[PDB]
């Protein structure tokens, strides 16, 4: 016979305290952008991006993260 | 015979406290963008993006995250 | 014989507290955008985007997230 | 004879600029206040104040001030 | 004869610029206040203040000040 008992116990805490959060300034792409092109030949696909793209400001009050995985395999 | 007992127990906490959150400024793409093109030849697909695109400001009060996976496989 | 008992127990909490949230400014694409084109030839598909597109301001009071997966497979 | 010409000229400016103003917290008198009195004798006037009184939060966007006095006296 | 010409000229500026102003916390009088009195005698006037009184938070965006005085006296 085979008995398997799987009783993990989790009383954990993940916690943050912050008195104040702020005065955040993100200013990407303030300068001048000039692109001059003459007599170009493209035979295959082209992807072009010019300017200010995909810039992120991310300011969570907590931003705390907890990842837990359990697996029991029997063969 | 085979007995499998699967009793994980989770009393965990994920928590944040923030006294104040703010005064956030995101200013992408303030500068001038100039694109001059003459005599270009494209034989295949073109994708072009010019200016200020896909910029994100994300300011959650909490933003706390908890991921948990359980799997029991029997063969 | 085979017995499988699957009794996970979850008393978890995910929580945030924020005293105040605000004064958020997102100003993408303030600058001037100029695009001058002469004598261009395109033989295949074209996608073009000019200006200020797909910019996001996302400010949830909580924004807390809890993902849980359970699977039991028997063969 | 007497001539008096009084021609002051004022082209002055007083100015402020503020991008954002806020997330201000004023919390006076959070603690406990206990006052126990036995066998007191007062022969003249009494003024008493107990608790949280006359607390001020003052948050003007400008709050700019200009004072000007002119006087001409003749005897 | 007497001529008096009074022509002061004022082209002055007083100016401020602030990108962001905030996350200000004022918490006076958080502790406990206990006042026990027995067998006191007062023959003249009494003024008493107990607790949290007359606390100020003052947050002007500008708060710029210009004072100017002119006087011409003739005897």
Residue numbers in the entry:
A (entry chain C), B (entry chain A), C (entry chain D), D (entry chain E), E (entry chain B): 305 to 379
Authors' account:
Dominantly inherited mutation D395G in the gene encoding valosin-containing protein causes vacuolar tauopathy, a type of behavioural-variant frontotemporal dementia, with marked vacuolation and abundant filamentous tau inclusions made of all six brain isoforms. We used cryo-EM to determine the structures of tau filaments extracted from the frontal and temporal cortices of the individual with vacuolar tauopathy. The ordered cores of the filaments span residues K274-R379 of three-repeat tau and S305-R379 of four-repeat tau. The CTE tau fold differs from the Alzheimer fold by having a more open conformation of the β-helix region, which contains an internal density of unknown identity.
